[PDB]
Design an enzyme around this catalytic site. Structure first.
Site, PDB file in Angstrom:
ATOM      1  N   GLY A  85     -29.262  -4.471  21.716  1.00 37.84           N
ATOM      2  CA  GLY A  85     -28.472  -4.717  20.467  1.00 37.84           C
ATOM      3  C   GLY A  85     -27.959  -3.334  20.054  1.00 37.84           C
ATOM      4  N   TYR A 139     -38.939   4.810  17.505  1.00 33.55           N
ATOM      5  CA  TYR A 139     -37.593   4.986  17.488  1.00 33.55           C
ATOM      6  C   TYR A 139     -37.067   6.075  16.275  1.00 33.55           C
ATOM      7  O   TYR A 139     -36.172   6.605  16.481  1.00 33.55           O
ATOM      8  CB  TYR A 139     -37.060   3.615  16.862  1.00 33.55           C
TER       9      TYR A 139
END
Ligand code: F43
Ligand code: F43
Ligand SMILES: C[C@@H](OP(=O)(O)O)[C@H](NC(=O)CCCCCCS)C(=O)O
Ligand SMILES: O=S(=O)(O)CCS
Ligand SMILES: O=S(=O)(O)CCS
Ligand SMILES: [K+]
Ligand SMILES: [Mg+2]
Ligand SMILES: [Mg+2]
Ligand SMILES: [Mg+2]
Ligand SMILES: [Mg+2]
Ligand SMILES: [Mg+2]
Ligand SMILES: [Mg+2]
Ligand SMILES: [Mg+2]
Ligand SMILES: [Mg+2]
Lengths: 442, 548, 246, 548, 56
Positions: free
Chosen positions: B444, B332
Site C-alpha cells: 500500500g 520504517y
C-alpha cells in the site's frame, strides 16, 4: 385541519396584521416563507474578497498566526471584483436565469452569494454552499490573473483555509450561518448550530425580529429532529407562535405593561392573570391561603408560559441593557412560576435546567462564554427543545455594549452579507404574510 | 571522501561495504543478540510471575538467520540494536511526544482587554508578573481561592509551568526572566527580528501541563487544564469576584478565541481530540523542532533533524501505535534517521543545487523539478547498487523509497525555495524508482504516491493545500508509513535554505525554544540516542507514590 | 401573587422576601460611603467607570421593545456591571440562597441573580447595585454573624459557628467585638483591608433568628412537616414526569 | 448501632459530632497538615532545581483556617488526607482507568467462521490453544513472521495478554486453562448459569494491551493494537499466506464486526475516540466493577462499590481532568466513597424498603417513587442537621445533593427492581432537598436535575433511554460533577437487589473477572485506600529503561 | 416495513436525518399507543427502535 387552534398575528410594532390564522399556517412544514428562510440559510455564503486579497499578499493562510514566508502573492482582487464575481457566478449557477445571486458589497470588498436552490435538491445536505462558492471564487481568481500552477494552491488556502488537514475551514475567508455537518451534537441539529450573535447581526438587533428568526430556526430543527412529530407537534407549533411570532400580541402586551417599572416577578403575575382570564388554567384545589392551578391543555399553558418567559427576558435584560442576566431570567422565571401556580414551567423544566447550566457556563472558569456565543447545538444550551435560545437572541439584541464577544466582534462578515437578505433580516414580516396567504389551504 | 554511511556499514558487517556475498545461518538465531537474549530471559520471568506464557523465541519463525544489525543514530557515534529505537523501549521518544501533547499556546491579549474594559482595571508588567507567580503555583494543580482544597504533589508535576513571550522587548525584559522565553537570547539576530515582528506587541503564554496527567488522559485535556488554571489565576491576581459574568470571557478566550493547539481534532473513523499526532500539520512539526535556531548555517542538518522528529512521531508512535500497534514500525522510521544514509543523499543534492543554481535561485517550475529530483533519485539508487551492504541495511523497499525521495524533494525545495515544487520532486522520485528497480514499497505504499503528482498543484476542496498546511489528516496521507515525517522535512527544506525563522507558525517556533522542556528539541537525534542508551530521564513517573 | 405554598413561619418568610409590597425590616443604618467601601468596586469620590457610552449618545434604530422598556439609571449612563455576593449560614440565617434569587427577581429590575450552596450573587449596573446593596445590607436579608458579604473564599455556609456565634470566614472580613457586642466589617467583600471599619450592628439573638429564618431544619421547623409545601413539590415532580412522556 | 459515619467524625474533630460550635484560625494554616507540609517542601525543591517558581502556600488564600480533615475510605479502616485521593497522587486510581482503557473484547465467532468456511481449516480447542500461545507472544509487541523485527521489552509490557471465555463448559475445559476466564470459578452458581446462558457456544477474547502504550497513546489505540496482533497470530497459527485476501476478513472482524469497546467515541465539542471515559455507559461501568460476584448477599455493598468506581472515574479523571483539569474534583467524588456516609443513608433506605415492601416487591410506579425517595431524602438531610460535624465534613452542597439523592435513587430501585423509577427518585430527591435547605449544589449542578423528571420517561430521540444505556454523553449529563458515578450505582441497584449477574453487558461483566488485571476490581474502595497509602504497584513504569 | 418520509420534510431540513428520526419516533409512538405501553416501560420501546443513541 389537524388542530383547531387559531391565532392573531401582528407586526413588530404591535399592530394587527391578520386575525384567526390556523396554527398550521405557521408550521415549518406548511409555511412557504419558513421554507424560503431555511433554504436561504442553507444556500447563502459571505465571501470576504478583501480578506482573501490580504491573506494572499501576506501569505497568512491556514489559521491564527500562520504564515508561509516566500509564498506571498499580490493580486488586485478587490479592484477586479466585478469580473471575478461574474466569472464565479457563471460556475455557481446551474442555468442562466435561476435563483443564483452574486452581489458585491462594500465597493467589492465583500460578496453576497446565494447558491442555486436546485444544487440542494440533489444534495444530501448543505455543504455545497461553501464548497461550490469556494471553488468558483478560487477558479475565478486564478483565471482573472492567470495564476500559475505553482502558486494557485495559495489562492485555495486563502479562500478555504487548512481544510482538509483540519476538519473545519480553518482560516477560511468565507462564512456561513451554518457550520459543518461533523460538528452536530446529534443528527438533525444543523439549524441549531447557528451562533446567537449571527442571528442578532442578521436582524440588525431588532429584538422581536431576532427572537423570531431564532425561534423559526430552533422550532424548524425540532421538526428535523422528530421532536415535533405526533404527540408533541402542537406543543412545538404553539411555542413557535406564542414565543417567537408574538401570537395574539401576548409577548408585546406583557412587555408594554411591565416595561416602565416591571421585573421578572411582575411579568409572571400578569401572565398568570392572562392565562386565567383566557381559560388556559383554572383553580384545581385550595390549600391554606394558596390556590393550586390546573390546566386541561398543557401545550397551551406551556405556550402562554413561554410568551411570558420571552417578555420577562425583554423586561429584565431590556432594563439592564445588558444580556448576561438572560441566564438568570431563564432560570427564575420558571422556578418562580412553578411555585406561584403548582403547574410545570416552560418545556416541563427543560428551560430551567438549560438555564442552570447556561448560568454556570457564563459566569465560571469551566467553559461557555457570554450569551452571544451560545446556540441550540452548544452542549450547554441544547436541552430545551426550542424555548430557551430565542430569549438569548432577544437579550443580545438588547445589549447596549457590555460584551467583549459581541456581534460586532464575532459576526461582522455575517452581518454585512446576511442582513442584506430581507427574509433573514425581517422574518416576522414574511412568515406572517405567508401564513395569512395560506390560511384557507390548512 | 567516504560516503557518510560507510562508517556505519563497516560497524554492521565483517565484510567491506562493497562486497557482494556473505554467509548466513551461522549466528545462532536470536542468541547472537544481547537484546534478544535480554528479551528471552525476561519473557521466561514474566510468564512465570503472571502464570500466562508471553515472549517465547520458539513461537513463529526464528529471528536472526542473518545479522541483526546495530544502527548508528545519524549525527551521533551511538550504535544500538534497533529494539532500543522502538518507542516503547525509548523514554526519550515517549517524552518528545508528551512534551508536544502537553503544550498549548494561549494569548493574553483578549484577556488583558477584558481586564481593562469590563473590569476597568490596569494591566502592567507588574500585574503580569504577579499573575505569572500565581499561575505557576496553580498550573501544576494547586489552589489559590477556596478553603479545604486538596492538591497535586508538586514533585509529581515538576515539569508543568507557564512562560510567556512577546515581540515587545520592553515588557519581555522587565518580567522575571524565570517566566520568559526570550526571543533575543534563543534565536540568532536575523531570526529574532523576524519573530518579534510577527508577534509584535502580542503577549502569549506557553503552558505545559504535567506529563503524568497527559499520560493518564489525552491531548484534548491540555487546553482545558491550561484554561482552568489561567482562569483561577486571573481571578486571584486581578481581584474579580471568584465567578462573575466576566469570568466566562477569560474561559472562552483561553479555550477557543486565543488558543493554539498543537493538533486539531480528527474525523470519526480515526476519532481523536486536539493535540494528537494526526492533527499536527507538517509545518508545525518543522517549527516544533528547534534545529532551525541552532544549525541555521547548515540547511541539510535543519531539514533532516525535522525528518527525524517526524519519522519517529508520525510513523512509530502515530501510525505504529495510535493507528495500528504491535511490533509496529520502528525501522520504517529509523531508515530516515540512522546510518547517515539520508544525510549522504541530501548533502549530495544540496551540493548539486548550490553548484548549478545557487540555493533558492532555481526557477520555481517543473523544469527544476525534473532536473533536480531525477538527478538526486539516481544518485541515491546508485548507492544501493554500489554498496550491497547498504541495500541489506535498508532492506525494505519502503524505507529506500522514503529516503531517496526525501533527499530528492528536499533538494528540489533547496533549489526553488518553495515546498510545493519540493513535493512534486518527491512524487517524481517515486515514479522513477519504481521503474528503475521494478518495485517500490509495501503493498500500500504508493496510494498517495500515485495520487501524488496530480494533487500537488490541485486547487480542489479536499485536494488543494500548500504542503506546510498538510499533515497526517490530509486525505491521501492518512494511512501510510514512510511519508509524513519526510514531508515535514520537505516543508522545512526551502525555509532552511532561505534562512526563514519559521515554516508555518511563528508562535509554535518560539514556544519550543525552552530548555525547561524535558526533551531537548534542539538535538532530536542526540536525544533519541540518549534514550536508546537508557540514559534519558523522563517526567511523569509514579515512583514517589509507590513502594520501594 | 402567592409566591410559595406552606403554613410554617419559614414559608411565610419566603413569601415576605419575594413580595415587593412587604416592607423588609430595617435593622441597621449604613452610610452611602460605607456601602461603596464594602462593595470595593470604586474609591470614595471616584466617578463611575463606564463600559459603553451613555444610551443618549447612541444612534439606536427604532425598536418597539427598547422603546417600551425603561433602562435603569446605570444603563442610561453606561455603568460597568458589578456585583455583591452573600453567604448565609445553615444555622438559621434569615435569608438563604434560593430565597435571595427568587426575591431579587421579584423586587429588582435589570438583575442577574445566581444561586449556589455557599454563595449567592447579583450583578447589575454599578449605581443601581449601590442602591440595592444598601437595602441588602441594612435589612433582614442580612445578619452580621450568620451572613457574610464575600466576593471570594466563600466557605462557611455549612460550617459550625465559632464561640461568638459567628460564621467561619477564611479571610475574616467581619469581626465580632465583645466590648460592643456589635460586628464590624474590617475588609471589603474581596478581602482588602478597609481604612476604617464599618459598624454592622448586633447579631440577631436566637429568638429573632428563629422568627426570621427561611431554612427548614429538624431543630427549627422541618420541611417534612410543612405538608402543603411538600405536596406542591411532589406535584411539580409528577406533572413534569407525565408531561415529558406524553 | 451507631450511625456508620460516627467513627469518622470522631477522628476528624475534637468536638463530639453533635456539637454546634468550634473555634477556627488556631491551627497554623497549612502547618497543621503533614501532606501540605510535604508539598511546601517539595515545591521549594522543584522551584530551586528548575529555576521557575512553583508550589507556594502564600500565593492566593491561606488554606487551613479550619481543620484540614482526614477521610476514612468507606468499608476500610484507612484514614488519609484528601490529597492522597487525588487521582494524580494515587497510582491505584490511575491504574484502574488504564486497565479499562487498555481492554477490549473481541469475538472469535466470525474469525472461526472465516477459518472454516473460507480457508477450509478445522477449529478445535487444540487449534484455539495454539492460537492463544501465539497471540500471547505477539500481543505485548513481539514478532512471529518477518526477519529482522525489533520488539518491545517483555518486562515493560508484562501486563498485556489475551484470555478467552465461552459459555460451553466442555469447550472451555479443553482450551489450556492458563488462557481461560473460568466462569464457574469466578461467579457463584446462579450467576454463572446466567452468564453461561448469555454467552452460549460463543467464544470471546479479552485483550489487554500494555499500560505503557495506553499512557503514551489513547484509548482508541486499544482495538487497533489488539487487531494487529490477533491478525499476525491468525496468520502464524492457522498457516495463511502472510497477507492474502482472507487476511482482511480477520482485520474487519477484529476491528469492527465482533469488537466490543469499553467506550464509544464522542462528538466533536468533546472529541475523543473509543475507550475514553465519556463513552463508557453507566451499565458497563457497573459491569466492570466486580463487587457483584463477591458481595452478592449485600446489594448495598455492590451498589456503593459501583458508585465508588464511577465517582472516581467519571468525576475525578473524566470531568476533573479530561474535561477540565487543575486542582480538579477530588472531594466532589470522595463524598460518595468516604466516611461511610452514603453507606449509612443507603442502608437506611434498604431497610426501610425491606420493612414496607420487601426488595423488588413494590409496584414499579410513581407512588413508590414518591414514597421511598421522599423518606430517604429526609433521613439523609436530617443527619446533616443533627450532626454539625457531618455538615462541616460534606461542606459543599453538591456533595450532599449527590449523596442524599444516590441513597434515595438506589433505595427506590431496590423497591421497584427497575432502574428508571430509581432515576425518577434521584430527581425528586434533588427537588425536595432544594426546597428544604433553599440551596442545592454549585451554580450549574441542577441542569440535568431540572430537565431530569421530564426526561426520565421521555421517548424522544435525544431524550429517551433506559438508565443502563445512558452515560456521560447523554446530553443532559455531559458536563457536570456529582451525578455520573451515582447513576452507575442506581443502574446497579435493582440488579443487585434482583440477584442479576450483570446490569447491561454480560461479556463486559466476565471480561473483568480476572486476577491478572493490575487493579483488583472486586474491591475498588480497598484499592483506592491502598493507592492513597502509596502501597499500590502500577504497570507502565519506565524504570527499566531509565537511569538507576 | 418500507418507509419513505415525505419529501416536503426535507425541503425545510438542513440534511437527511429527518428520515430515520421521524420514522423512529412515529414507530415508537405507534407501538406505545397500540399496546398502551406505560410511562414506566415505554423507554424500552425507544431503545429497541433507535438503540443506544444519544449516549452513542
Ligand atoms: C504479514 C505481513 C502482511 C501485513 O499486513 N503485514 C506484514 C507483517 C507486519 C508485522 C510483522 C511482525 C511479525 O513478524 O509478527 C508488523 C511488525 C506490524 C505489526 N503487526 O506489529 C509489520 N509488518 Ni511488514 N514490516 C516491515 C516491512 C515489510 C516488507 C519487508 C520486505 C523484506 O524484504 O524484508 C514487506 C512488504 C514489502 O515487501 O515491501 C512486509 C510484509 C508484511 N508485513 C507481511 C509479511 C511478510 C513476510 O511474510 O515476511 N513488511 C519493511 O519493509 C520494513 C519495515 C518492517 C516493519 C517493522 C519495522 O518498521 O521495524 C514491519 C511492520
Ligand atoms: C472560582 C469558583 C468559580 C468557578 O468557576 N470555580 C470555582 C473554583 C474552582 C477551583 C478552586 C481551586 C482554587 O481554589 O484555586 C476548582 C478546584 C477547579 C480547578 N480549577 O481546579 C474547583 N472550583 Ni469550586 N469546588 C468545589 C466546591 C465548590 C463550592 C464550595 C462551597 C463551600 O461552602 O466551600 C462552591 C459552589 C457552591 O457554593 O455550591 C464553589 C465555588 C467556586 N468554584 C468558585 C470559588 C468559590 C470561592 O470563592 O470560595 N466550588 C464544592 O462544593 C466541593 C468540591 C470543590 C472542588 C474541589 C474538590 O472536589 O476537591 C472545587 C472545584
Ligand atoms: C461546556 C464545554 O466547554 P466549551 O463551552 O465548549 O468551552 C465543555 N466543558 C465542560 O463540560 C466542563 C465539564 C467539566 C467542568 C465542569 C464540571 S461541573 C468542553 O470543554 O467541551
Ligand atoms: O505486506 S504489506 O505490504 O501488506 C504490509 C507491510 S508492513
Ligand atoms: O462556583 S461554581 O458553581 O461556578 C463552580 C463550582 S466548582
Ligand atoms: K494517554
Ligand atoms: Mg496559466
Ligand atoms: Mg380563598
Ligand atoms: Mg530583571
Ligand atoms: Mg537541556
Ligand atoms: Mg537533557
Ligand atoms: Mg441612610
Ligand atoms: Mg520567589
Ligand atoms: Mg489480586
Amino acid at each position: 385541519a389537524k388542530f383547531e387552534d387559531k391565532v392573531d398575528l401582528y407586526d413588530d410594532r404591535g399592530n394587527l396584521v391578520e386575525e384567526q390564522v390556523p396554527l398550521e399556517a405557521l408550521s415549518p412544514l406548511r409555511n412557504p416563507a419558513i421554507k424560503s428562510i431555511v433554504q436561504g440559510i442553507k444556500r447563502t455564503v459571505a465571501v470576504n474578497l478583501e480578506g482573501i486579497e490580504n491573506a494572499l499578499k501576506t501569505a497568512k493562510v491556514g489559521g491564527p498566526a500562520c504564515k508561509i514566508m516566500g509564498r506571498e502573492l499580490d493580486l488586485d482582487i478587490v479592484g477586479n471584483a466585478e469580473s471575478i464575481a461574474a466569472a464565479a457566478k457563471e460556475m455557481i449557477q446551474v442555468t442562466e436565469d435561476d435563483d443564483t445571486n452574486v452581489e458585491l458589497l462594500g465597493g467589492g470588498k465583500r460578496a453576497l452569494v446565494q447558491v442555486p436552490s436546485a444544487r440542494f435538491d440533489v444534495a444530501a445536505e448543505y455543504s455545497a454552499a461553501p464548497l461550490v462558492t469556494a471553488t468558483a471564487f478560487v477558479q475565478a481568481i486564478i483565471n482573472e490573473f492567470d495564476v500559475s500552477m505553482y502558486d494557485a494552491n495559495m489562492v485555495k488556502a486563502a479562500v478555504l483555509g487548512r481544510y482538509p488537514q483540519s476538519v473545519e475551514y480553518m482560516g477560511a475567508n468565507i462564512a456561513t450561518m451554518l457550520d459543518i455537518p461533523q460538528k452536530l451534537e446529534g443528527p438533525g441539529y444543523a439549524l441549531r448550530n447557528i451562533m446567537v450573535n449571527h442571528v442578532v447581526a442578521a436582524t440588525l438587533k431588532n429584538t422581536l425580529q431576532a427572537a423570531a428568526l431564532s425561534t423559526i430556526l430552533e422550532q424548524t430543527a425540532m421538526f428535523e429532529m422528530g421532536d415535533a412529530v405526533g404527540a408533541f407537534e402542537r406543543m412545538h407549533l404553539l411555542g413557535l407562535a406564542y414565543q417567537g411570532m408574538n401570537a395574539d400580541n401576548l409577548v408585546f402586551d406583557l412587555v408594554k405593561a411591565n416595561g416602565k417599572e416591571g421585573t421578572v416577578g411582575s411579568v409572571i403575575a400578569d401572565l398568570v392573570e392572562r392565562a386565567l382570564e383566557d381559560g388556559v388554567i383554572k383553580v384545581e384545589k385550595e390549600l391554606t391561603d394558596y390556590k393550586v392551578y390546573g390546566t386541561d391543555d398543557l401545550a397551551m399553558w406551556n405556550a402562554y408560559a413561554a410568551a411570558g418567559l420571552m417578555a420577562a427576558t425583554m423586561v429584565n435584560q431590556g432594563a439592564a441593557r445588558a444580556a448576561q442576566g438572560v441566564s438568570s431570567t431563564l432560570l427564575y422565571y420558571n422556578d418562580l412560576i412553578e411555585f406561584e401556580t403548582g403547574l410545570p414551567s416552560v418545556d416541563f423544566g427543560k428551560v430551567e435546567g438549560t438555564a442552570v447550566g447556561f448560568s454556570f457556563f457564563s459566569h465560571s472558569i469551566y467553559g461557555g462564554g457570554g450569551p452571544g456565543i451560545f446556540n441550540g447545538n452548544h452542549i450547554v444550551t441544547r436541552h430545551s427543545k426550542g424555548f430557551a435560545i430565542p430569549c438569548v437572541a432577544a437579550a443580545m439584541a438588547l445589549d447596549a455594549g457590555t460584551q467583549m464577544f459581541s456581534p460586532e466582534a464575532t459576526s461582522g462578515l455575517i452581518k454585512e452579507v446576511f442582513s442584506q437578505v430581507d427574509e433573514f433580516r425581517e422574518p416576522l414580516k414574511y412568515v406572517v404574510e405567508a401564513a395569512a396567504e395560506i390560511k384557507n389551504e390548512i | 571522501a567516504d560516503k557518510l554511511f560507510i562508517n556505519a556499514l563497516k560497524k554492521k558487517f565483517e565484510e567491506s561495504p562493497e562486497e557482494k556475498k556473505t554467509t548466513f545461518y551461522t549466528l545462532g538465531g536470536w542468541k547472537q543478540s544481547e537484546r534478544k537474549t535480554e528479551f528471552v530471559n525476561a519473557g521466561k520471568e514474566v510468564a512465570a510471575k503472571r502464570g500466562i506464557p508471553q515472549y517465547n523465541p520458539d513461537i513463529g519463525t526464528p529471528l536472526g538467520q542473518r545479522v541483526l544489525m546495530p544502527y548508528q543514530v545519524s549525527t551521533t557515534d551511538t550504535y544500538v540494536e534497533g529494539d532500543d529505537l522502538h518507542f516503547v523501549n525509548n523514554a526519550a521518544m515517549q517524552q518528545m511526544w508528551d512534551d508536544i501533547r502537553r503544550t498549548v499556546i494561549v494569548g493574553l491579549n483578549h484577556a488583558h482587554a477584558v481586564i481593562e474594559k469590563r473590569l476597568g482595571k490596569e494591566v502592567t508588567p507588574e500585574t503580569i508578573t504577579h499573575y505569572l507567580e500565581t499561575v505557576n503555583h496553580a498550573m501544576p494543580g494547586a489552589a489559590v481561592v477556596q478553603e479545604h482544597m486538596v492538591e497535586t504533589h508538586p514533585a509529581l508535576v515538576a515539569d508543568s509551568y507557564v512562560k510567556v513571550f512577546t515581540g515587545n522587548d520592553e515588557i519581555a525584559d522587565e518580567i522575571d526572566p524565570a517566566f520568559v522565553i526570550d526571543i533575543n537570547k534563543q534565536f540568532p539576530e536575523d531570526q529574532a527580528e523576524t519573530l518579534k515582528a510577527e508577534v509584535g506587541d502580542g503577549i502569549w503564554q506557553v503552558v505545559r501541563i504535567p506529563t503524568i496527567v497527559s499520560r493518564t488522559c489525552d491531548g484534548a485535556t491540555t487546553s482545558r487544564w491550561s484554561a482552568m488554571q489561567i482562569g483561577m489565576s486571573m481571578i486571584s491576581a486581578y481581584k474579580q469576584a471568584a465567578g462573575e459574568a466576566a469570568t466566562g470571557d477569560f474561559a472562552y478566550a483561553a479555550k477557543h478565541a486565543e488558543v493554539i493547539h498543537m493538533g486539531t481534532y480528527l474525523p470519526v473513523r480515526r476519532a481523536r481530540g486536539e493535540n494528537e499526532p494526526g492533527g499536527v500539520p507538517f509545518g508545525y512539526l518543522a517549527d516544533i523542532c528547534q534545529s532551525s535556531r541552532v544549525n541555521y548555517e547548515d540547511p541539510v542538518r535543519v531539514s533532516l533533524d525535522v525528518v527525524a522528529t517526524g519519522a519517529m512521531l508520525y510513523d512509530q508512535i502515530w501510525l505504529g501505535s495510535y493507528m495500528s500497534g504491535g511490533v509496529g514500525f520502528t525501522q520504517y522510521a529509523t531508515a530516515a534517521y540512522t546510518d547517515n544514509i539520508l544525510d549522504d543523499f541530501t548533502y549530495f543534492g544540496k551540493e548539486y543545487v548550490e553548484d548549478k543554481y545557487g540555493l533558492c535561485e532555481a526557477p520555481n517550475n517543473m523544469d527544476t523539478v525534473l532536473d533536480v529530483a531525477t538527478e538526486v533519485t539516481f544518485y541515491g539508487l546508485e548507492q544501493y547498487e554500489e554498496y550491497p551492504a547498504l541495500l541489506e541495511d535498508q532492506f525494505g523497499g519502503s524505507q529506500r523509497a522514503a529516503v531517496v525521495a526525501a533527499a530528492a524533494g528536499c533538494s528540489t525545495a533547496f533549489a526553488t525555495g518553495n515546498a510545493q515544487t519540493g513535493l512534486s520532486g518527491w512524487y517524481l522520485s517515486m515514479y522513477l524508482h519504481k521503474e528503475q528497480h521494478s518495485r517500490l514499497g509495501f503493498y500500500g505504499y504508493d496510494l498517495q504516491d500515485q495520487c501524488g503528482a496530480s494533487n500537488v498543484f490541485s486547487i480542489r476542496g479536499d485536494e488543494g493545500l500548500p504542503l506546510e498546511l498538510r499533515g497526517p489528516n490530509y486525505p491521501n496521507y492518512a494511512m501510510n508509513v514512510g511519508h509524513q515525517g519526510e514531508y515535514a522535512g520537505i516543508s522545512q527544506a526551502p525555509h532552511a535554505a532561505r534562512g526563514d525563522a519559521f515554516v508555518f507558525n511563528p508562535l509554535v517556533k518560539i514556544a519550543f525554544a525552552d530548555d525547561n522542556l524535558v526533551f531537548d528539541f534542539t538535538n532530536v537525534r542526540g536525544e533519541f540516542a540518549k534514550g536508546a542508551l537508557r540514559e534519558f530521564e523522563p517526567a511523569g513517573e509514579r515512583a514517589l507514590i509507590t513502594p520501594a | 401573587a402567592q409566591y410559595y405554598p406552606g403554613t410554617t413561619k419559614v414559608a411565610q418568610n419566603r413569601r415576605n422576601f419575594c413580595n415587593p409590597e412587604y416592607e423588609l425590616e430595617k435593622l441597621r443604618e449604613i452610610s452611602d460611603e460605607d456601602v461603596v467601601k464594602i462593595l470595593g468596586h470604586r474609591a470614595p469620590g471616584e466617578e463611575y467607570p463606564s463600559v459603553h457610552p451613555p444610551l443618549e449618545e447612541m444612534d439606536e434604530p427604532e425598536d418597539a421593545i427598547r422603546e417600551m422598556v425603561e433602562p435603569i439609571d446605570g444603563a442610561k449612563a453606561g455603568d460597568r456591571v458589578r456585583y455583591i455576593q452573600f453567604t448565609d449560614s445553615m444555622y438559621f440565617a434569615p435569608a438563604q440562597p434560593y430565597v435571595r434569587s427568587r426575591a431579587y427577581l421579584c423586587r429588582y429590575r435589570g438583575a442577574d441573580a445566581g444561586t449556589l450552596s455557599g454563595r449567592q450573587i447579583i450583578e447589575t449596573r454599578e449605581r443601581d447595585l449601590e442602591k440595592i446593596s444598601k437595602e441588602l445590607l441594612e435589612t433582614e436579608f442580612f445578619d452580621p454573624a450568620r451572613s457574610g458579604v464575600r466576593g471570594k473564599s466563600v466557605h462557611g455556609h455549612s460550617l459550625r459557628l465559632d464561640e461568638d456565634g459567628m460564621m467561619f470566614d477564611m479571610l475574616r472580613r467581619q469581626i465580632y467585638n465583645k466590648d460592643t457586642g456589635r460586628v464590624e466589617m474590617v475588609k471589603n467583600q474581596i478581602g482588602d483591608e478597609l481604612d476604617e471599619p464599618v459598624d454592622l450592628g448586633e447579631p440577631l439573638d436566637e429568638e429573632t433568628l428563629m422568627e426570621k429564618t427561611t431554612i427548614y431544619r429538624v431543630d427549627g421547623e422541618a420541611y417534612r412537616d410543612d405538608v402543603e409545601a411538600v405536596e406542591i413539590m411532589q406535584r411539580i415532580h409528577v406533572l413534569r414526569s407525565q408531561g415529558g412522556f406524553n
